């Protein structure tokens, strides 16, 4: 993907994350656990639904048209009728092929984006209290219990509370 997160610096996805599309796993003094991030899951899904609504959209309505099957050889005028239909089908076939390929490239890129946005939002929250370990994981340089982890996921983690402790651990 164009951001390098999914199938990039995050080695692989999590089959055990069954209640969201993106999320956090943590390790701390009390153990390990997981949680979905709703707002990024919803972002990816909303975009994808936007794209579905545009495509699953009302088919045109046509009634009487030209004929497209013929029981007798007639020559010039039937040549035309066939060429007309064959030309339309090829054009529409091309459109459908291109559409699906563009959308799919964009779908894979936008979901990559969201993963990357969530990571960056997290990196920003932690300030000087953590280092990026390169695989999508943050080493956090202070005691960080389940509530603390919870505040990181809520967006109410106050880095100044932990700053003297983390800076001390980071630089020795």
């Amino acid at each position: 993907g164009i951001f390098g997160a999914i199938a990039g610096f995050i080695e692989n996805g999590w089959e055990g994350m069954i209640d969201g599309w993106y999320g956090f796993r943590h390790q701390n003094s009390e153990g390990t656990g997981q949680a979905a991030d709703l707002k990024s899951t919803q972002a990816a899904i909303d975009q994808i639904n936007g794209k579905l609504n545009r495509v699953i959209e009302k088919t045109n309505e046509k009634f009487h048209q030209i004929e497209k099957e013929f029981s007798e050889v007639e020559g010039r005028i039937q040549d035309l009728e066939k060429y007309v239909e064959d030309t339309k089908i090829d054009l529409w076939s091309y459109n459908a092929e291109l559409l699906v390929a563009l959308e799919n490239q964009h779908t894979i890129d936008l979901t990559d984006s969201e993963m990357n946005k969530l990571f960056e939002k997290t990196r920003r929250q932690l300030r000087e209290n953590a280092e990026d370990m390169g695989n999508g994981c943050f080493k956090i340089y202070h005691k960080c219990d389940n509530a603390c982890i919870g505040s990181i996921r809520n967006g109410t983690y106050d880095h100044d509370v932990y700053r003297d402790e983390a800076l001390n651990n980071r630089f020795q």
Binding site: W14, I18, F24, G136, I140
Partner: protein, 106 residues
């Protein structure tokens, strides 16, 4: 003494392969089919008014070939001509048959 916080995304046991701009087969978690390839096999009689021609072509019902007398004054949204139709009156031909059948049908 510290913690580790890991960022990630889901995967599924059964991915499906799709086509992209740069990749002929790449695996995503889900996809949906955009080409209808099956039919129930029947013509539905709603919401369009279907008129089954049974043994009759439109032109025969027009002229009033005796076995087609049941079609007198009928209306239709879609007139269905069957392959088993047959003529059973005076042998005739229509110059630009296709055009007559078209304009009546329309």
């Amino acid at each position: 003494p510290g913690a580790t916080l890991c960022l990630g995304h889901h995967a599924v046991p059964n991915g499906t392969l799709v086509k992209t701009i740069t990749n002929d087969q790449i695996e995503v978690t889900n996809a949906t089919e955009l080409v209808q390839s099956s039919s129930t096999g029947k013509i539905c009689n709603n919401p369009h008014r279907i008129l089954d021609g049974i043994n009759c072509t439109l032109i025969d019902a027009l002229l009033g070939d005796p076995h087609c007398d049941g079609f007198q004054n009928e209306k239709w949204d879609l007139f269905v001509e069957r392959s088993k139709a047959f003529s059973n009156c005076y042998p005739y031909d229509v110059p630009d048959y296709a055009s007559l059948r078209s304009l009546v049908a329309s």
